Write an enzyme that holds these catalytic residues in place. Structure first.
Site, short mmCIF file in Angstrom:
data_model
loop_
_atom_site.label_atom_id
_atom_site.label_comp_id
_atom_site.label_asym_id
_atom_site.label_seq_id
_atom_site.Cartn_x
_atom_site.Cartn_y
_atom_site.Cartn_z
N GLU A 10 0.81 -1.22 0.00
CA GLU A 10 0.00 0.00 0.00
C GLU A 10 0.85 1.28 0.00
O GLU A 10 0.49 2.27 -0.63
CB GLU A 10 -0.96 -0.01 1.20
CG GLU A 10 -1.78 1.27 1.40
CD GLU A 10 -2.61 1.64 0.18
OE1 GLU A 10 -3.15 0.73 -0.48
OE2 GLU A 10 -2.75 2.85 -0.09
N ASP A 19 -6.45 9.87 -1.86
CA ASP A 19 -6.22 8.63 -2.60
C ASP A 19 -6.87 8.68 -3.98
O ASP A 19 -7.38 9.73 -4.38
CB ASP A 19 -6.73 7.43 -1.79
CG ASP A 19 -8.23 7.44 -1.60
OD1 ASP A 19 -8.83 8.53 -1.56
OD2 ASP A 19 -8.82 6.34 -1.47
N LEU A 31 -8.02 5.50 6.46
CA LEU A 31 -9.01 6.54 6.11
C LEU A 31 -9.15 7.49 7.29
O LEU A 31 -8.53 7.24 8.29
CB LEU A 31 -10.38 5.93 5.73
CG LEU A 31 -11.36 6.80 4.94
CD1 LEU A 31 -10.80 7.08 3.55
CD2 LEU A 31 -12.74 6.16 4.83
N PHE A 103 -8.10 -5.36 3.20
CA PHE A 103 -7.71 -3.96 3.42
C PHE A 103 -8.07 -3.06 2.26
O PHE A 103 -8.77 -2.05 2.44
CB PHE A 103 -6.21 -3.85 3.71
CG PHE A 103 -5.90 -3.58 5.16
CD1 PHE A 103 -6.19 -4.52 6.14
CD2 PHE A 103 -5.31 -2.38 5.55
CE1 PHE A 103 -5.90 -4.27 7.47
CE2 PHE A 103 -5.02 -2.13 6.87
CZ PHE A 103 -5.31 -3.08 7.83
N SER A 116 -12.51 -19.24 -5.13
CA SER A 116 -11.19 -19.17 -4.52
C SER A 116 -11.23 -19.51 -3.03
O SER A 116 -10.43 -20.29 -2.56
CB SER A 116 -10.57 -17.78 -4.72
OG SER A 116 -10.43 -17.47 -6.09
N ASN A 131 -7.56 -18.66 -10.22
CA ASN A 131 -8.83 -17.93 -10.12
C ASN A 131 -8.65 -16.47 -9.67
O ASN A 131 -9.34 -15.58 -10.18
CB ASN A 131 -9.80 -18.66 -9.16
CG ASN A 131 -10.54 -19.81 -9.81
OD1 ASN A 131 -11.73 -19.93 -9.66
ND2 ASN A 131 -9.87 -20.51 -10.68
#
EC number: 3.2.1.17
Length: 833
Positions: A10, A19, A31, A103, A116, A131
């Protein structure tokens, strides 16, 4: 682990930023608020962090904001019925991989993955990755997603490995793009900009141009001049050799590689370059440790000046080389390794990559703890106690302005010595420590270069402070750089302008009052015109060589100094002696008298005997009457013209007092661990004051009431040398010794009287023996017993001497022998003529 994963993926932004969505977000995707107001983001930020952040938070605070998201997200995972069983089924590593997905995309995005999560729950890793790779998420962020997808398959952090590991090297750059190649084969321009490699070439060029001449000249100048070659400079010469190894072994090789952009010499060349670079740095380090130790012991204790010959200096240089090889050799022979560091140009010790094959953990700890803390403790203690001693000593006699200038120059240098040491080694130690504590983090090539800058810079600026700023070496190099340049009796000056006269050399010291110096000075009116002639009394303590002591830090201490004016005088002398009247009538018109008096707190003229092999070693107290001419006012004593000045040494000798003290008669008894019977011993002498060359009958009387037998009875005339300069330091030594073979039986008494003859002739070729002060290399006798005036104010500095008869009984006790002994004081002085 998980924190390092998301920090790399990130990206950790400290300040508030908008962002891709355009919302106020802080830290690692943490945030703040949905509102368009920035202060609304600050409101929740300030409350969460707990202070006035103003948008700016620490990296550790962003870590805590992240840990709150980890806690909150994990709770959200367990709330969801689809995510909870998958989270419970997977291990800690794959759980962190799931949290990465939760996240960014949120619970919403991850909740959509049906196939998955079924296959992940069923321990099917490959088809899950297939997948996941076929989704919008891999399309969105293939950089981030590809790393996480591989993590799910393997179950290890191999995708999240910071740099690119190798067999003989470690590049601090990701090979995910597929650009990393061997530093021993291909160029390394992907690490940093090509112009920074040219910067490294220019930097290493600068170190060779500055480094080689300074250190080579240090040695070259020493080969020429005899003055410099002294034991204390031996360690400074070792420092020059150490820095030369950093130039020839280290920088020249680094220069060649920096031009190409990669290490051309291979693993073999990297080992040898790193070996010499370490050896040069470590010998330089321990040289400064030894230098600090030497300067502390030699200056504070004047006796150690004699002790420090070539052999002790060689041991210091040997110890330096041993400690250097102790840490330089193991990298070659397994314990740690030499690899290309930073830009993969310079080779150095591996203190970043944790490789348990070569044991870097134990090595970095061993090196860091020992090589950082031991110099830090020793050097700060050495120069700290040195300045402590000098400042207290300077405060003891503030009257002497010469000591104040020294103390100032000393303290200024010691502050610079500390600053130079810290600037050198703290960058390496701090970065190595920070890398060890934060192993999960990434460190760039330029980051590792910053310590290398300051440490290799020390190869230059240490010679500046320790050699170039040194007073002797500065004046010696000045010569080389500039091509070789840049009855009554009297004594005449070199220029033959001023001529001093004195009635006698040996001035007497009575206990109450000292016999003052008396004499005159003849002056030439034509030569001395518009000048000021001063007659000066000087008492001085001398230790070590004259040129070397001024250079190290501070110079020899003057016990007492007093200058007096002469031509023209303030008025005249009050009343003249028979000597001054006689000299005035004998000599011409231009004769002026002077009367210099001694105070009651000074010592006598005493020197210490050197060994025959000690060619260049001397320590002793002496008095000096000097007369000179000058243009400058009174306080300009510190410097004097060599040509106009004329000096004649004198003595403050003590004759034996007319009335002898009480007849010495010591007595002492003893007991033992098993036998509780008493062993009474009583000693007695003929006189309190013995004279030089006189027999000393020691009438020992031993009355034995114990069970044990005595082996023998030994008597010894011991000279106690009490030396005082900075601190009170006694030094005991035997002079004469005689022992009888007779044995005292149980319940039997004995009365014997052994004679002892203390002489200089028998005590020749011995170090540390105190003698009466010589005039000019002539024969003298054993030092006289010093007498101090009763209840004086000031402390008596200088070499104080005293004698005592020490009888010792070798007692044959229960193979083992017990040696009991007692002392009685006496005086050895000259008779009244």
């Amino acid at each position: 682990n998980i924190f390092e994963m998301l920090r790399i993926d990130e990206g950790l932004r400290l300040k508030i930023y908008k962002d891709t969505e355009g919302y106020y977000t802080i830290g690692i995707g943490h945030l703040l608020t949905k509102s368009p107001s920035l202060n609304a983001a600050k409101s929740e930020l300030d409350k969460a962090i707990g202070r006035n952040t103003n948008g700016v938070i620490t990296k550790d605070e962003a870590e805590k904001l992240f840990n709150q998201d980890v806690d909150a997200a994990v709770r959200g995972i367990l709330r969801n019925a689809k995510l909870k069983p998958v989270y419970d089924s997977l291990d800690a590593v794959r759980r962190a991989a799931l949290i990465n997905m939760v996240f960014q995309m949120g619970e919403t995005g991850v909740a959509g993955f049906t196939n998955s999560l079924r296959m992940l729950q069923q321990k099917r890793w490959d088809e899950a990755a297939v997948n996941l790779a076929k989704s919008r998420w891999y399309n969105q962020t293939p950089n981030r997603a590809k790393r996480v997808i591989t993590t799910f398959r393997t179950g290890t952090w191999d995708a999240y490995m910071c740099g690119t590991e190798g067999p003989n090297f470690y590049v601090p750059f990701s090979n995910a793009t597929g650009v990393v190649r061997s530093p021993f084969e291909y160029p390394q321009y992907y690490l940093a900009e090509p112009w920074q490699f040219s910067m490294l070439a220019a930097y290493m060029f600068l170190l060779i141009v500055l480094g080689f001449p300074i250190n080579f000249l240090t040695l070259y100048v020493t080969v020429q001049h005899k003055k410099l070659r002294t034991p204390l400079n031996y360690i400074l010469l070792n420092l020059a050799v150490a820095d030369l190894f950093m130039v020839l072994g280290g920088f020249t090789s680094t220069l060649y590689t920096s031009l190409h952009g990669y290490f051309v010499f291979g693993p073999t060349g990297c080992n040898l370059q790193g070996f010499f670079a370490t050896l040069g740095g470590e010998i330089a380090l321990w040289s400064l440790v030894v230098l600090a130790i030497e300067r502390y012991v030699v200056v504070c204790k004047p006796m150690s000046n004699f002790r420090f010959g070539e052999n002790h200096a060689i041991m210091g240089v040997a110890f330096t080389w041993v400690m250097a090889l102790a840490c330089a050799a193991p990298p070659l022979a397994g314990w740690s390794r030499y690899i290309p560091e930073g830009l993969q140009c310079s080779c150095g010790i591996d203190y970043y990559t944790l490789k348990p094959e070569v044991n870097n953990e134990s090595f970095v700890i061993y090196m860091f703890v020992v090589h950082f803390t031991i110099p830090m403790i020793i050097i700060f203690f050495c120069y700290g106690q040195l300045v402590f001693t000098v400042k207290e000593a300077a405060a003891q006699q503030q009257e002497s302005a010469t000591t104040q200038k020294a103390e100032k120059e000393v303290t200024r240098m010691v502050i610079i010595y500390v600053i130079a040491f810290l600037i050198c080694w703290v960058p390496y130690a701090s970065v190595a420590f920070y890398i060890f504590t934060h192993q999960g983090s990434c460190f760039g090539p330029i980051f590792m270069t910053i310590p290398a800058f300051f440490a290799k810079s020390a190869a230059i600026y240490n010679p500046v402070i320790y050699i170039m700023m040194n007073k002797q070496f500065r004046n010696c190099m000045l010569t080389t750089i500039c091509c070789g340049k840049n009855v009554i009796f009297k004594k005449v000056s070199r220029d033959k302008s001023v001529t001093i006269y004195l009635g006698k050399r040996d001035y007497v010291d009575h206990v109450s009052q000292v016999e003052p110096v008396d004499g005159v000075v003849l002056v030439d009116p034509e030569l001395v015109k518009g000048k000021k002639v001063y007659v000066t009394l000087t008492c001085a303590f001398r230790y070590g060589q004259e040129d070397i002591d001024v250079m190290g830090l501070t110079f020899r201490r003057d016990l007492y100094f007093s200058r007096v004016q002469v031509y023209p005088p303030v008025g005249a002398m009050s009343v003249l002696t028979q000597l001054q009247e006689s000299l005035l009538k004998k000599l011409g018109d231009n004769t002026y008298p002077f009367l210099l008096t001694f105070p009651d707190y000074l010592p006598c003229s005493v020197m210490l005997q050197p060994a025959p092999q000690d060619v260049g070693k001397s320590c002793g107290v002496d008095f000096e009457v000097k007369a000179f001419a000058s243009d400058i006012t009174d306080p300009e004593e510190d410097k004097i013209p060599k040509k106009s000045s004329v000096r004649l040494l004198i003595r403050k000798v003590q004759h034996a007092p007319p009335e002898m003290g009480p007849q010495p008669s010591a007595e002492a008894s003893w007991q033992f661990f098993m036998s509780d019977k008493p062993l009474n011993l009583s000693v007695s002498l003929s006189k309190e004051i013995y004279f030089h060359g006189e027999p000393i009958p020691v009438t020992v009387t031993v009355t034995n009431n114990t069970d044990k037998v005595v082996k023998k009875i030994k008597v010894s005339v011991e000279q106690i040398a009490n030396v005082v300069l900075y601190s009170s330091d006694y030094y005991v030594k035997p002079v004469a010794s005689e022992e009888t073979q007779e044995k005292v039986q149980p319940n039997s008494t004995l009365t014997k009287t052994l004679v002892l003859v203390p002489l200089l002739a028998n005590n020749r070729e011995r170090r540390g023996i105190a003698l009466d002060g010589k005039i000019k290399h002539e024969d003298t006798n054993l030092a006289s017993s010093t007498i101090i005036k009763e209840g004086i104010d000031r402390t008596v500095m200088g070499i104080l001497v005293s004698y005592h008869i020490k009888v010792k009984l070798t007692v044959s006790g229960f193979l083992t022998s017990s040696e009991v002994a007692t002392e009685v004081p006496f005086r050895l002085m000259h008779p009244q003529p």
